Structure formats: C-alpha cells, structure tokens
Amino acid sequence: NEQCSPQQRTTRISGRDGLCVDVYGALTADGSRVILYPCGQQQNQQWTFYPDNTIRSLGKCLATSALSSGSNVVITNCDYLRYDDGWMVSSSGTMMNKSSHLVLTANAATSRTNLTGENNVFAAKQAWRIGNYVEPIVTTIIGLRHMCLEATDNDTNVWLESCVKNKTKQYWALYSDDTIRVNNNRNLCVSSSTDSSSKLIVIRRCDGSINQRWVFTPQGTISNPGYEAVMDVAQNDVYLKKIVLSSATDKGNGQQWTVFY
Amino acid sequence: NLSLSQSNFSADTYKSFIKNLRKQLTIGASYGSAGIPILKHSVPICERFLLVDLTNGDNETITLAINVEDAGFAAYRAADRSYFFQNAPPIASYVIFTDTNQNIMNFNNTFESIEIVGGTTRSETPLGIMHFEASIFHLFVHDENYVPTSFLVLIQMVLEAAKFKFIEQKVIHSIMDMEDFTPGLAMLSLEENWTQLSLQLQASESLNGVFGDSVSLYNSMDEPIGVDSMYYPILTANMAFQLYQCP
C-alpha cells in the first residue's frame, strides 16, 4: 500500500489567536524570518511536509536560528540541514526541534509577530494546528450527566447545565492554539486557576498561557499538558457548579468529555 | 454476551453498552502516535466474532455477530434460525450459530448494498429507541421487506456509534429529547470516511501527523471541514477506533 507511505503533503499551520505561520513578505533569502499573519492562500503560508522531517515553504526549510532560546525561526536552504534530524510534532501540536528541543512559539498574538524558538512550557502560544482548515471549530462540550458546559456569570465562570440547542453560552470555539473560547466573545478563554489556593477552572482574557491550553485526548479527557492534569467535575457532582483541574484518575466519570459540533 | 434491552434503554445504559462494546472490540488493539486504538487483524476465524444480544419490547432477542476486524455485522441468530450476509467470511458458518437453521441474505453488510436492496437510504430512515425496538422485531421474524432498513438502523445505532462519539451522542440526544432523527451530513460523512480516516491516521506517522489526503467531515450546520492531519478535535475526540491499514 503506497498510500501508507505518502511522499509529501502541503498544508497550512495555524496557531495563536487563529493566525498563520507565514514567511514575512515571502522573502526567499537564507534566514528570512517566519511570523504570525492572518491566514490566506498565499504561497508563503503553505507548508509542505516530507518523510525527512522537513517543513517547507517557498522551496526552503523551516528552522531554528540558534541553539539557545529567544531567536527567530526562519527558512533556510534545506541542503544546510542535510545532517540534522529536523522537526517532531507532538500529538498536542507542539512543534519541536528534535535536536535542540526548542519549540515554535509566538511571544505575542498580533499580526507580524516574530516566531521564535523557545523552551517548551506547554503554553497556548506554543500550540499549533497543522492543517489547511484554520477556522475555529464551534462546538458544545458535553460532560457528566450528559450536560453541557455553559459560560456563566457574565462570562467569568463555567459549569455544567442541561443542554439546550439554542443556548448561546453553551457554544465554544476551539482555536488552533488549543484554546477553548467563548463562542460569542472570542477574547475570552477557558483557563485553569491562577490563584494557587483554588483548582477552579474559570474564563479569563486570552493570554497565550499554560492555563488556557487544552487538549482533547483520544481517551475522552480534556487535558492541560503543562499542568499534567485534566478538567473534572468537582466531587463528581454537577450541582456543585464547579469544574476543577485534577490528576487523571478512573474513580468517577467526571473526567470524561465529548465534543458535539 | 454483551446486552442492550428495550426495557432498560436509558442514556446511561446505552452509554455503558457502547463503552463496553468499544472495550471488547479493542482488546489486543495496536496503537500509534494518535492514540486511537487500531482493531486487530488477520485474526483466526474461531476468534473473529464478538456476540451481542439485543432485546425488544416483546421479551425477544437476537444475537448479532460482529467481526472484530472491521466492527461490521457478519450474521445474526433468532431462536433456532440464523442469517449470514453473503459478504461474511466464508468459513463463518462453521464457527458461529452452528446448531441453527442457517440462511444467506442475498446482499452485503455494506450500506451501499443494503440501500440498493431495500430501496431506501439512511437519510430517510429514522433512528430512535422505537426504531431500535422495531428493527429488532423485524429481524427476529425475518420479514424480508423490513430486513434492510432494520440493518440501517441497528448498524448505525450500535456499530457506527461505537466507531464515533459524535454518533453515540446523537443517539443520546435522541434518548433524552424523546425525539427520533435521521442522520445528516455530519453523521453520514463519518460513516462514509471511517475507513479512509483509519488509513490516513496510520499513514500520517511518516509525515509528522499529516495526512496524504484530506477528508471532508461536515458539521451540524452542514459546513465541510477538511481534516488533513491528526490535529482536529472533531476526529481525535470522536473516532474511538480504527480499521487496521498500515504496517
């Protein structure tokens, strides 16, 4: 089956705030930098993947420019990277230089922001969707007792309520940066607690942090990989109106979730 | 045998059923980067079938044989009678429903074949508890003019829901709303592409999670979403297991 060994594929890479990985001005010189930029059909947002672990736009290779954190990711001649292992993408969308362990990162959300190779901390600003379809995915999120997450208290809290199809606040926009956004106000992100004395999951202004990065795992959990923990119904009791961050256990059903889209 | 009865068909019960069905089917499953279990393959015919019992509003019961390689029905028993798709593994007769009066249905276990023979499509075939109930009845007596749509119903309500949480959830929403439904583009596009998604996922290993080909999955607003990699929650948090496709 030659289908099992695809020779290449051309796609986009979208990340923070739904913006795209873009070679600035489509410049083709060795070391021409990659940036955040609104998604479109332009050649310099087109990334071709290969079995050799190279990611290419404009015939050249996505790369780091430095062994230490803080420097731009660029495109360079692919011949230069002839003896390097290249990129590895984790199943959560972390794009990592195999050798240096540095990861594709967006230190700000605005258009034209320089992408840099940074130390991995599982922030949302380090989370990428590799894929031609770059739009947020609108969904309901179904948990315990078949109830829906609802955004509450003027979009400041979140908990389970009986699912209602019309209901605006039960709709969630799943961004390419692994954020879970209030559909109706996409500046607002579902966030793990910032007060250490609480585990309460809440809604806050999107900021690219570890607290706002979520992963829908094949095993039915909603994971925050940075905090090695998962979204959970407090005490397996939906009537407590509280969703917390917990270690992954099989003791109840409160760590099980479904996406309905 | 794993069991779902009409007399005890809540959302929770249905959910346990589908959950336990996935577990059983995925015993010995292999795993890739995606983490979605891949069904066993080249399984000896003596081990290839998993039996499930469905019971309707009469206290009446059929036992369906699921091929653990492809999560499809091969055959079923009703009392002293059994029925095999002509599609079935050709030795299945010697292994399942041995002392019954075995019969061959003159069609394959595929939606295409079933829709041609019955003259009716999934889009126009309702799904719900009483359709589940009645489908079982029609199969028990083997009333030939209802057998195809009965399969459309049961395949989707048992096997395709096992394949896809989305579909599981349509059946849950149906149970709780006390509302029948017909599948839309969203559900059908998953059914259509089970095989292709399995292939792309397994092939994606050699391209950092990226598919050799895009797959169109509709949402509930009938908008197409091109899934050309492993990085879509609508795939990853939906497809519960895959057909074995690549070494």
Ligand SMILES: *[C@@H]1O[C@H](CO)[C@@H](O[C@@H]2O[C@H](CO)[C@@H](O[C@@H]3O[C@H](CO)[C@@H](O)[C@H](O)[C@@H]3O[C@@H]3OC[C@@H](O)[C@H](O)[C@H]3O)[C@H](O)[C@H]2NC(C)=O)[C@H](O[C@@H]2O[C@@H](C)[C@@H](O)[C@@H](O)[C@@H]2O)[C@H]1NC(C)=O
């Ligand atoms: C997004 O990426 C772009 C592309 O790299 C950044 O543009 C550049 O900014 C550099 C400074 O951070 C410039 O380097 C300097 O150039 C002047 C010119 O002589 C020099 O006086 C400076 O000392 C420095 O020269 C370097 O000195 C240190 C040495 O180690 C090094 O070898 C020297 O090159 C660079 O020329 C400039 N390039 C371009 C194409 O504009 C951009 O940097 C941000 O904007 C630039 C224009 C400048 O304002 C920077 O200070 C500012 O950080 C970067 N954007 C951001 C937000 O970081």
Ligand SMILES: *[C@@H]1O[C@H](CO)[C@@H](O[C@@H]2O[C@H](CO)[C@@H](O)[C@H](O)[C@H]2NC(C)=O)[C@H](O)[C@H]1NC(C)=O
């Ligand atoms: C991944 O990171 C490593 C280490 O920073 C990069 O390796 C260097 O690559 C340059 C250009 O080929 C060489 O001139 C250096 O000698 C290499 N240094 C080391 C420590 O190996 C590598 O190029 C990066 N690859 C990608 C695809 O980003």
Ligand SMILES: *[C@@H]1O[C@H](CO)[C@@H](O)[C@H](O)[C@H]1NC(C)=O
């Ligand atoms: C049934 O499947 C076979 C291959 O197994 C195919 O040749 C044939 O077209 C199908 N026939 C029917 C009865 O639809």
Ligand SMILES: OC[C@H]1O[C@H](O)[C@H](O)[C@@H](O)[C@H]1O
């Ligand atoms: O200024 C940035 C901008 O430059 C050009 O317009 C390119 O076509 C865009 O893709 C983008 O990189």
